[PDB]
Structure 1
Amino acid sequence: MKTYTAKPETVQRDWFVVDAAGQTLGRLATEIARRLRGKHKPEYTPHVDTGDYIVVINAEQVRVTGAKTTDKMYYHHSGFPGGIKSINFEKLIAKAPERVIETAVKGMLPKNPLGRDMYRKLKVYKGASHPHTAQQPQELKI
C-alpha cells in the first residue's frame, strides 16, 4: 500500500475563463496560481503538472488599491552598464495590459522547469473575447 502518485499521461485538464474587471491584482492572481498548480485537486502531487487551463479576458480593467496606480514601479536590467529601466502601473496598462497579470502570477509560481510549464497554461487577453471557443471554457468566479 503505497501513496498514490499522479501520472503525467492520464491527468484531466479543464478550461476556465475569468473576468478581471474590478478585481484586485494580487487577490485575483492567488486564485489563478492555485488552479494553475492543481492544489484544488485531491490528486495533487508536487512533481507533475496537474492543474487547469485559465483564460483571462478583461486584462486592462484590473485595478490596485491606494496610490499604487502611480507609485507601483516595475524594474528590469538590460545587461549593459547603467541599463536599469523602469515603468509604473499607469504606463504599463497603456503599453501592455497583459504584462501586468502575467508578471503577478509568474512570481507566485515555482522557479524551475515545472514552474515554467505551469505558466504556459495561462492565456491573457484585453478584449471581451478570446480565441478559445473550441475548447469551451467555463466561467470561474475569483
Structure 2
Amino acid sequence: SEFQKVVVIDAKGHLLGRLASVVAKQLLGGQKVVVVRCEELNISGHFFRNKLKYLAYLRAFHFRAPSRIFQKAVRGMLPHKTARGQAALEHLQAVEGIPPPFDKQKRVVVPAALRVLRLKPGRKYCTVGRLSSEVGWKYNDIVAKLEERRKVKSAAFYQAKLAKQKKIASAKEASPVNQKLSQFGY
C-alpha cells in the first residue's frame, strides 16, 4: 500500500528469507530500507542445522556479523551484476541493535515475514545473532548491554508520552464539541 521515503524495520522475530525477499523487492522499488536489530533475526530449523549450513560456507570473505549475514541474503535476491541491482544494495542499511539516528524513529514490521505468523508452533528456530556468536562474532555481549540501556530510556520516554497523552485524552471528553457532533464516527 502506502510507502515512505525511508523505512526503518525492526528485525526482531522476522524470518531471514521472508524478510530479505520483501526487502529486496522494496529496494528495487526505489525505497530506502534500514533494518535494525539484525542480530535478532530468526531462521526456521534447528540451531544445529544452521550451524552446519554456516560451517559449510566457512569451508571469498566469510562475514560473521549478523547485519552482514542479512545483507548477503538480500544481495542474492538482487541483480547485483547490473547497475540497477548495484544501486538497490546501496539503498539498504543493515545494522545490529538500534543506533541513535534510528532510535527515535518509528520502526515498522513485515507481517509476511514474522516468525509467529509463519512458523508452526513448537518448531525449532535459531536466532541469527545467537547463531553468529559461535562463528566469530564477539560483540553479542556488549550489543545486548546497550539494548537494555536503550530499552530503559525508551520506556521512560513512553511513560512521559503516555502521561502527556492522558492529559489530552481527559480533555478530549471535556470539550462538548466532541459529543455534540460525534455522529461522523469521530
TM-score bucket (shorter structure): 0.5 to 0.7
The runs of at least 4 consecutive aligned structure 1 residues that moved more than 2 Å come to: 73-78, 128-133, 136-141
Greater relative contact order: 1 or 2 (C-alpha under 8 angstroms, separation 6 or more)?
A: 1
Change (3 A) 1:23 1:14: same
Cα shift readout 1:52-107 (whole Å, capped 9, x = no counterpart): 000111001111111333122225847xxxxxxxx6xxxx6xx4121111000000
Match of residue 8 from structure 1: none
Shift of 1:129: 2.9
Which runs of structure 2 are paired with 1:79-118 in the superposition (5 Å)? 95-110=64-79, 111-118=81-88
Match of residue 69 from structure 1: 50
Q: RMSD value over aligned CA atoms?
A: 2.6
More strand by share: 1
Distance 1:61 1:16 in 2: 18
**Could you tell me the TM-score, scaled by structure 1's length?**
0.62
Match of residue 108 from structure 2: 140
Q: Is the 8 A contact 2:36 2:94 kept in 1?
A: yes
Corresponding letter in the other structure for 1:126: E
Percent of aligned pairs sharing the same letter: 32
Choose from 28, 34, 40 the match for 1:55: 34
Match of residue 17 from structure 1: 8
Tell me which structure has the larger Cα radius of gyration.
2
3-state SS of the aligned residue for 1:64? Answer: strand
Q: Is the 8 A contact 2:9 2:35 kept in 1?
A: yes
Change (3 A) 1:138 1:52: farther
Distance 1:64 1:117 in 2: 27
More helix by share: 2
Q: Is the 8 A contact 1:57 1:130 kept in 2?
A: no
Q: Aligned residues, how many?
A: 103
3-state SS of the aligned residue for 1:128? Answer: coil
Q: Is the 8 A contact 2:8 2:102 kept in 1?
A: no
Change (3 A) 1:77 1:34: closer
3-state SS of the aligned residue for 1:72? Answer: helix
In structure 2, the gaps of 5 or more residues are 111-186
3-state SS of the aligned residue for 1:16? Answer: strand
